[model samples]
Target chain A: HTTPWTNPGLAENFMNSFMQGLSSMPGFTASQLDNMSTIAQSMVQSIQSLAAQGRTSPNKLQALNMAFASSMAEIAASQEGGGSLSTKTSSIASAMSNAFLQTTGVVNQPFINEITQLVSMFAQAGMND
Target chain B: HTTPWTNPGLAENFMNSFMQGLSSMPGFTASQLDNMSTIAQSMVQSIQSLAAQGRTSPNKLQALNMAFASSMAEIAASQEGGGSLSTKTSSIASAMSNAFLQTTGVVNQPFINEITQLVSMFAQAG
Candidate 1:
């Protein structure tokens, strides 16, 4: 059960197209594009939840991914007019993604700021010595 | 001189208020919020450049931040109607921010995907 999800690399497969599209856009700069990387990381995380389950602990990733595969099968099954399985699966995936992106707009900046600030403070406090 | 810029931590100050705004937004979730953390991290990066310059080294953060201070000063200096210094300064900051966010939308996801893929691939191939 668990073996299948280990290093399954589902997040990359899910985000590959979106990533390619991002780079292709003109008028993008490194300074600016780096910021988008922040968001992109989060997007992958959400899918990791879908594909791998927990990012850090290395647990349940395969089981979660299998669930996604199951959902995709539902999507495929429904596309052929046999059942609404895949349709519902994809819909949930779409909804979860949309919700993830929209929800991220909140606190995403502040969280990053906090992390940067905390790091900066550590660097600063050291200077005083 | 450089003292003003050394570990000024201006990015933290500027981001704190804005961060509160982000967190205060209701109906948010951690999985979703982590994604925002990515954006937040980038926003902080842009300002860090303003605060410290070339992030990897401590060369220009101070100058850049001082420039921001100078712009803020100009904003104050202009408030009295003598010059538009401050107005111009703040405008640039605003523009950089707006442009940053808009531009970030383009490649943020893809770049992230690439990194995840790279890392995941590394983990996978290993």
Candidate 2:
């Protein structure tokens, strides 16, 4: 019951986008934003956990990714709408940025650029909403 | 006058031991142990900082490593010796264990083992 997010790269990509999208909104509380970031980190761990159990592949990952998207969308909808998503967005971003830049031991600029683009797109969508 | 602890590997080894040694002793306060752990981490960062400035080598690493050892000896001396160093030792061990085992992107068992031995020795000495 996992998605293509079984791949760390893919999962990280999705989470960066997902967090950027939700954080840029205006309604999420600090607790919600933090909760969301923790959720993203947890999801990444789950993917790794599943792999350790010897259950993963592109097909499995893709299927799980759909579930991933659905869950995040549901979470976004559950939060109160119309608040300062930007404030929490920056906080979440800084937290993730420090984590990504530090202990992970490797830096991938393209990966960051992808998250940046997704954040921009998501923020724009939120603006139109 | 930086010591040889400038190498990440060497610094990690020393910090692991330093934390372990301080922890295994008796009489250290919770905050003292925690503060020492932070100092160990900070020293690691300083090593990296010097490297970023284009100053790192076996010789430099050796000097820094000596300084690291000296500092730990001093810190151990400051604590009200004869308290429960083991208590704080285990706590610091757990905290450092999580950090080393979790993020950091790679695992080197030998490096950990070296720290373990140092901790054992220092705790014994303390």
Candidate 3:
């Protein structure tokens, strides 16, 4: 049941890298970063718990992510001065994945070279910023 | 322009009634209620603030309501084991309005009493 090509750790490491990228962003204050970190931790727990219980339905995963993102958006938007930070974070999150074809490229192999290039631009932007 | 006909306060009161109806529903826990109350308070502030500056745009009102409802749904869904409570409360919220045709019945007055009689069965069910 094991495949030589797949490293299950990629998902975990991608999430870690994403969080680290977020931490490097300038607009988020300490409290905001903490808030985001807390929510990300919760998502990790939920994913593991669902896996442990063998409840690996894609529907559940989608619903959980949707609900998680919704709450985070609400929380971030509710902050007194965090709207810009929240909006930028969401924008970058979407742009990074879409640019890099994160799902298709890494996980499913969409082979979109342009997307990879675009995504690398963002990754480099993150690195340079 | 006073005709003893329209009360602008009715919209506010209808919202209050809808919320109080939610409060009475069983199977909702207290912490959930607090979360609901805080969000409701925020909406009230938003509406009042918009009104205070004379910023009366229907689009803003609609957008605010949609955003508020979405957040409430998300928070309610995320509790340790509150899915059933959250779902049931949302169901009742929809049912209450549809049962009474709260919009048309009170303000718009699209009267189809026979159809409404059936609805009152649900209203009383509520």
Candidate 4:
């Protein structure tokens, strides 16, 4: 019951710290941070949604991650100036994969592949700059 | 009480699935996957250690991430054949940073910078 994800308030405060930390980072743009904040919200909501439905199974977590990773790709399609941000998001997605493994044990290859491709394209696109 | 992180057994099962998932991926290797399995254990243990300490704070989560990210970097030093895996681990660390934001709200620039630089160098190295 006391786990960080279960305690919504604790999670929210933790999110606050993320926003604050993002605020201080010189590398990311305001727009990028905005999107990050939005994605961050979805991440926690996914946890809470699973928790509410008694769906905290690692399988369910993997599904949630699959869904989350898809959204990142969909959003990237519309994002402007997202090369570096794309890389960052890919890393975040990788972290989520690791967290799933850590929390639930699913490696989430699709998520990994999705983000890796994202970075691959994003990285390959650099010469245009 | 029923949260995913609190039930370590469930977490381990989840890790099994991850190991399986890693096994199927064409992009990574056994050695890399083994290292990943090692980090995955650390990620869960960090949560358990905090839960044992009654440290459900976002701040505490940030510290764990920073620590985890650092370990990723340290292990990276001795890692042979680790360029692409460095990128993957960088992504994992980035994901951890995002997860912190998702769970705790800490941006963790140092962690970000640490891994970004990690990616930068590793990327540059390759």
Q: Is 3 or 4 the stronger prediction by TM-score?
A: 3
Question: Which runs of model 3 end up more than 4 angstroms from their true locations?
Answer: A1-129, B1-11, B82-126
Ranking by lDDT: 2, 4, 3, 1
- By TM-score rank, best first, the candidates go 3, 4, 2, 1
Q: Per-residue lDDT for B6-118 in model 4, tens only?
A: 34343334434434444444434456555555545545544565456564333223323323333344334334563465555545554545443443354445545545554
- Backbone clashes under 3 angstroms, per model: 19, 26, 0, 21
lDDT of 4 by residue, A1-129 (tens): 222233444344444444444345443446655655554554555456545756454323332333333334333433345346555554455454544444434454543554455344433322110
* lDDT (Cα, tens digit) per residue for candidate 1, span A15-67: 33333443444333443334334333433454444434333222223222222
Candidate 3: tens digits of C-alpha lDDT, residues A66-98: 333333343344333433643545543543354
Sequence-dependent TM-score of model 1: 0.20
| TM-score against truth, every candidate | 0.20, 0.29, 0.37, 0.31
At residue A122, candidate 2 shows an lDDT of 33
Model 2 C-alpha lDDT versus the unseen true structure: 0.44
- Candidate 3 per-residue lDDT over residues B72-115, each given as its tens digit: 44334433343464354454455345423443353222212211
* DockQ list for all candidates: 0.02, 0.01, 0.04, 0.02
lDDT of 2 by residue, A12-100 (tens): 56556556655655556675555455445544554565567655444334333333332233233334453554543444344345434
lDDT per residue as tens, model 2, B7-113: 45545555665466556655566755654564455446555665665555543443343334333433443345434545544543454444444434334444334
Q: For candidate 3 chain B, which ten residues in a row score worst on lDDT?
A: B1-10
Cα lDDT for residue B121, model 2? 41
iRMS values for every prediction: 23.2, 24.2, 15.4, 15.6
